[PDB]
C-alpha cells in the first residue's frame, strides 16, 4: 500500500518508485523508508524536497 | 580467505551439506575468516557455488 502511494507521488513530480528510492539510497543520509508514504500523502511540499534530493544524488 | 554462505543446502547432495557444516556455516549470510591450507582450501572448492569467496 505504501509502495503504491510512493510512485503515485514520485510520478506526480516526473519520477517513479524504482528511480526515487534509488536516489534516496544514493543520498545515504536518507534512511526514511518507513513512513515515506505519509510524507507523500499528507505533506506534498515536504515530499517534493525528497524527490528533488533523490534526482540530485542520481544525476 | 573471507567466506559467506549465499545459497541454501536444501536440495544439495549430502557431502556438500556436510562440508558447509565443517566450514562452520549454519545460515545463509554466515560469513567467516578462513585458513589458507590445502584441506581448508579444498572444502571451500567443494562448495564453491554455494559460497561467495573474497580473496
Amino acid at each position: 500500500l505504501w509502495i503504491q502511494r510512493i510512485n503515485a507521488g514520485a510520478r506526480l513530480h516526473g519520477m517513479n518508485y524504482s528511480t526515487f528510492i534509488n536516489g534516496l539510497k544514493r543520498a545515504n543520509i536518507d534512511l526514511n523508508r518507513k513512513v515515506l508514504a505519509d510524507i507523500a500523502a499528507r505533506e506534498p511540499e515536504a515530499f517534493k524536497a525528497l524527490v528533488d534530493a533523490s534526482r540530485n544524488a542520481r544525476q | 580467505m573471507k567466506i559467506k554462505l549465499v545459497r541454501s543446502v536444501i536440495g544439495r547432495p549430502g557431502n556438500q551439506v556436510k562440508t558447509v557444516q565443517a566450514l562452520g556455516l549454519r545460515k545463509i549470510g554466515d560469513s567467516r575468516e578462513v585458513s589458507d591450507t590445502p584441506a581448508v582450501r579444498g572444502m571451500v572448492k567443494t562448495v564453491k557455488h554455494l559460497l561467495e569467496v573474497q580473496e
Binding site: 543520498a27 545515504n28 543520509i29 536518507d30 534512511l31 526514511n32 518507513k34 513512513v35 510524507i39 505533506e43 511540499e45 515536504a46 524536497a49 525528497l50 534530493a53 | -
Partner: protein
C-alpha cells in the same frame, strides 16, 4: 518504528519496544531523520544536527493474542499465548 523513531511530531505519548530505563523520567534522545518543526524541510544527517528528547511514561504488556497453528489430517493443533512488552514515551524534543 524499528525502535528509535524520528520526524517532526507535536509532543505525543507514543508506545514503542522496551527501553530498560525503569519508571518515570529515564529520558531518551533520538537521532532524527526528517523534520518541519520551524518550516525548515531538512533530512538525513543534516537532521542529525538536531536530536529529540523524550520522557519514559509507562512500561507495559500488550493485549493478549493467541498463537493458533493447524495442519490438516496430520493431527497437528497448537495453542500458545502471547503478550508484547512495550514502553510508552512522551515526546518533548528540539
Amino acid at each position: 518504528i524499528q525502535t528509535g523513531g524520528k520526524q517532526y511530531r507535536v509532543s505525543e505519548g507514543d508506545v514503542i519496544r522496551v527501553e530498560s530505563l525503569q519508571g518515570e523520567a529515564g529520558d531518551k534522545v533520538e537521532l532524527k531523520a526528517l523534520f518541519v518543526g520551524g518550516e525548515q524541510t531538512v533530512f538525513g544527517e543534516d537532521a542529525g544536527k538536531y536530536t529529540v528528547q523524550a520522557e519514559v511514561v509507562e512500561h507495559g504488556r500488550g493485549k493478549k493474542i493467541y498463537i493458533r497453528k493447524y495442519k490438516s489430517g496430520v493431527q497437528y493443533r497448537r495453542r500458545t499465548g502471547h503478550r508484547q512488552n512495550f514502553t510508552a514515551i512522551k515526546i518533548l524534543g528540539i
